[PDB]
Amino acid sequence: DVFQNKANVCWAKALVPVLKTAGIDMTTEQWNTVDYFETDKAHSAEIVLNQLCVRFFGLDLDSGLFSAPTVPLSIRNNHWDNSPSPNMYGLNKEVVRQLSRRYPQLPRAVATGRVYDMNTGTLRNYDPRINLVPVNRRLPHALVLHHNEHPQSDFSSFVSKLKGRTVLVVGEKLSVPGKMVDWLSDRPEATFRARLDLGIPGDVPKYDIIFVNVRTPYKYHHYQQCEDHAIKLSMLTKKACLHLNPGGTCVSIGYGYADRASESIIGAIARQFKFSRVCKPKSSLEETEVLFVFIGYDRKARTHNPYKLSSTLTNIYTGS
């Protein structure tokens, strides 16, 4: 009803009873501020929950604010529902009590379904721009000071320069001279034509190089753009690993890993390759944009290179 004309928002439906525990009752207009709701695309109910928790209460899920085992979020088939399951969520009152020490007005917000404004300590009506960043989370790298309006980047040259015979370009079209290029996209010209919100089709083959040429809109904050891109990291970039030949390379547009999902996904991917780099070629104009470069798909157990990518992101984003 709130959901009329929507085919792929079962993730928003599964959330309804979860949000209701924090007094939250989303209108259609409020769901419209989640982009995959507006464009009616498949999404993770857990990433969405994290994102709403930030917007509402200035904290992400790691705070435990929704850790009560009240309502399950489950995936039967490939859609979300509330079918019985150990993966349970719900406003946790003990955590609210503990947090009210630092945020005395938070109990009121989770009772009202209003926003707890981290900047002012007061209540507010919903708007996605009040709590831009979760305050319980130590970001693992710096974020840009400024974001401007630049022309879209072109990575043809960068992909050409990579070792590899066969290339799968995912998302936007890219011509890559000297390489055999398959194009995966919902565009009708595509070599393999598919809905990308469903992820990489199991039926696509293996490649020496996969390029995820997918971007996410900057709307109002670096953190916002990085968290909106996360579902794409998971559905495309992470699945790309199952379509690499031994020693192949995965390359992906990105905005860092400010949010917890992205950080989890990038780590899962990085630990499968001999090398993990962050590059920002002289073609990447947008300030928040980077390429994640994973070379040497070998799935050998090695030691954790985590501060390397963070340092590099930090230097990039502060300009250093």
* DSSP string over 165-222: SEEEEEES----TTSEEEEEESSTT-SEE--GGG-S-TTS--EEEEEEE------S-H
Could you tell me where the DSSP H helices lie in 233-286? 260-270
- The catalytically annotated residue of 43, 53, 79, 226 is 79
Both tokens assigned to 251: 């390359």
Catalytic residue flag (residue 10): yes
Tell me the residue type at 268.
A
Catalytic residue flag (residue 79): yes
* DSSP string over 78-99: TEEE--S-S-EEB--HHHHHHH
Q: Are 25 and 12 in contact (CB under 8 A)?
A: no
* Closest of 68, 81, 84, 73 to residue 22, by C-alpha: 68
Q: Are 51 and 227 in contact (CB under 8 A)?
A: yes
Tell me the residue type at 81.
D
State how far the Cα of 136 lies from the Cα of 60, in Å rounded to an integer: 7
State how far the Cα of 72 lies from the Cα of 237, in Å rounded to an integer: 27
Chain centroid to Cα 102, Å, comes to: 29
Taking residue 191's Cβ as centre, other Cβ atoms within 10 Å add up to: 13
State how far the Cα of 163 lies from the Cα of 176, in Å rounded to an integer: 12
Q: Which residues are catalytic?
A: 10, 79
